[PDB]
Each structure stands twice: as C-alpha cells, then as structure tokens.
Write a protein that binds this ligand. Structure first.
Ligand SMILES: CCCCC[C@H](CC(=O)NO)C(=O)N[C@H](C(=O)N1CCC[C@H]1CO)C(C)C
Ligand code: NI
Length: 164
C-alpha cells in the first residue's frame, strides 16, 4: 500500500520514535509499504515518523536505477567524521530544498528487513541521506538548521502548494 506522507506544519512530525521491539510480519509490511511510498513519491529515503508510524524504521534507495533497497531498523550511530552539505529536499516539505550541515562519513549499526544486525560505513549521498532519515526519527527536519526567515519562506510555500 502507498501511505500518505505528513507535511509541515503537522506536529506529528516532531514525535520521537520508539525502537522496533521485534522485526516481524507487521514490521515487514510497514517496511514494504514505506518503500512503495518512497518510490511513488520519488524519494531516496523515508522514515516511519513521516507516515505517522512512530517507530525507528527507515527505508532508503540511493541507486541510479532505483533497485537497491536498504532497510535501517533501530539504527545507531557508532562513529562519524568530517563535514559536508548539499541542497536537501524532504517529502514532508514538498518542493523546497536547502543546504544543511552534515557529517561527511558515518558508521552505523542497524537491523535489516529480516531482523539481522549489520554494520554499515557510508559516505557521499548515502551518508547524507542516513543522517536526514535519522533526524526524522528524533523529530528533526532539515529546515530546523536554517534562519527564521528561511523557515518562514519554506512554510509559506508548502502551505500554498498544499492549498492548491
Ligand atoms: C539528501 C538527503 C535525503 C533526502 C530524503 C528526501 C526524502 C525524505 O523526505 N526523507 O525523509 C529525498 O528523497 N529528497 C530528494 C533530495 O533531496 N535529493 C534527491 C537527489 C539528491 C537530493 C537533492 O540534492 C528530493 C526528492 C527532494
Ligand atoms: Ni525528509
């Protein structure tokens, strides 16, 4: 199923996700529906918070052909280094993008779609995406790193888009 993606200024986007207790069929249904949503909305990642599921579940596909699924369940940041920043957009902040500071590289541990633990070192866009996705799990959005003026401008554009 394709799920509705919450948009600013919805307060549900600020909720802090709980850890997944067990990776079972219910969770796999959620993961699969998150992928479907992500692809339908042309994203490269999605966090459960965005679909109003406050659990630490993240789906990602940063591949050119959009056929490389990555699942981060209960991700934990182990190490990071350097700094970087690209103009990021967000499906909860439709059509707006801005550069925000991010770690260049990250090493994380998480559970996959089967509930098996794995470690992953990432750089480039994957590291940026992980960070963005992990921020959604603690109720944080890319616009939070910007000035009040920029935040207000983004808020108004999203509301108008949604109004139309
Ligand atoms: C880059 C950090 C991760 C961005 C994730 C968002 C999806 C999101 O809202 N997840 O929470 C995305 O797909 N955004 C895209 C995005 O920002 N992109 C896609 C290509 C790289 C970057 C643009 O610079 C477009 C659809 C707005
Ligand atoms: Ni986002």
């Amino acid at each position: 199923s394709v799920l509705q993606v919450l948009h600013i200024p919805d307060e549900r986007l600020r909720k802090v996700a709980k850890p997944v207790e067990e990776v079972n069929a219910e969770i796999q249904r959620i993961v699969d529906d998150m992928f479907e949503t992500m692809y339908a909305e042309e994203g490269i990642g999605l966090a459960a918070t965005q679909v109003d599921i406050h659990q630490r579940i993240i789906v990602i596909d940063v591949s050119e052909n959009r056929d490389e699924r990555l699942v981060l369940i209960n991700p934990e940041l182990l190490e990071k280094s350097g700094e970087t920043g690209i103009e990021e957009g967000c499906l909860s902040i439709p059509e707006q993008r801005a550069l925000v500071p991010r770690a260049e590289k990250v090493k994380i541990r998480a559970l996959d779609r089967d509930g098996k633990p794995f470690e992953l070192e990432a750089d480039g866009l994957l590291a940026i995406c992980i960070q963005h996705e992990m921020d959604h799990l603690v109720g944080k959005l890319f616009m939070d790193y910007l000035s009040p003026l920029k935040q207000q401008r983004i808020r108004q554009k999203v509301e108008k888009l949604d109004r139309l």
